[PDB]
Amino acid sequence: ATEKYHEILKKYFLSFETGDFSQVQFSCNLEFLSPISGNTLKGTEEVIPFLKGVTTRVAEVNIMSTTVEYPRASGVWQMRTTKGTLYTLHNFFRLDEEGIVYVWPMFDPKAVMENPDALIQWLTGKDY
Amino acid sequence: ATEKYHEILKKYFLSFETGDFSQVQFSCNLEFLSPISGNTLKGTEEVIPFLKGVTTRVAEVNIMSTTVEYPRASGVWQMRTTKGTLYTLHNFFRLDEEGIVYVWPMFDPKAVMENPDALIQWLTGKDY
Numbered sequence A, B: 001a002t003e004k005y006h007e008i009l010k011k012y013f014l015s016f017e018t019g020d021f022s023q024v025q026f027s028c029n030l031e032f033l034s035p036i037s038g039n040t041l042k043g044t045e046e047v048i049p050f051l052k053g054v055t056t057r058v059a060e061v062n063i064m065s066t067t068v069e070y071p072r073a074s075g076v077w078q079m080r081t082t083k084g085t086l087y088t089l090h091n092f093f094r095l096d097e098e099g100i101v102y103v104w105p106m107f108d109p110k111a112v113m114e115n116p117d118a119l120i121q122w123l124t125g126k127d128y
Helices: A002-018 A044-055 A110-114 A116-124 B002-018 B046-056 B109-114 B117-124
Strands: A026-032 A058-069 A072-081 A084-098 A101-103 B025-031 B058-070 B072-080 B084-095 B099-106
Touching: A002 A044, A002 A058, A002 A084, A002 A101, A026 A044, A026 B109, A058 B072, A072 B025, A072 B058, A072 B084, A084 A116, A084 B058, A084 B072, A084 B084, A101 B084, A110 A116, A110 B109, A110 B117, A116 B109, B002 B058, B002 B072, B002 B084, B025 B046, B084 B109, B109 B117
Parallel strands: A026 A101, B025 B099
Antiparallel strands: A058 A072, A072 A084, A084 A101, B058 B072, B072 B084, B084 B099
16 A cells, blocks of 8 residues: 555656646545645645646656655655756655645755746746 | 654754754764755764754744655754744655664745745855
8 A cells, every 4th residue: 555655646746747637646635735825725626727737837757756654755856847947846745545635845945046036937837 | 663763853853943963863874965065965074063053043943744664754844043034844864774864955935935045044154
């Protein structure tokens, strides 16, 4: 079952290559702590359109590691934007019996400090 | 013991509130991936002086969660700077038989985006 949870995180990360999130196991109680909002996005109905929008500005994905101590999980990965900025992320996850129930992306600070304005533009697509 | 590692991570985080890192179990092969350098800091000899310097600009510490799947671990926590800004971090760790052997701090992007220069001044102490 733990091996199954690592596979679920990897399928979440790989969805950013295509914008197809249909292979990801998401809970009916999914919540997402967005970099662009204080309040969480609630449900696949709110989370997926946000993620699909971001994927339109992703050129490449690199998975470095996944860590699981059920119901908690974390993963280190990277996204190369369509302008070429390489962000490195450390996502916090909560898991339940239906898969991923909480996602909270955090970032390695170097790419952000090197061009602060670029992150909000990539996240929002405004002035991108 | 798995709980041994949860305790080691908690002792790592709490050392930022006290400034004494002597209770933390660190490996002789410790490496640290710093936000202010491309090359890792090597050994407690290079790492501890850096962390001690950062702790002079730390006020409160809050530990939110710890996750261990030996030899990997992670934890979500927070530090208030001595000026009052709350940073939320998601540290990536590796572990060995002597405790923590690798540390890589990453950050929730909101406090960073709000004031990019403030992060570098807090990290480096230059113009803080």
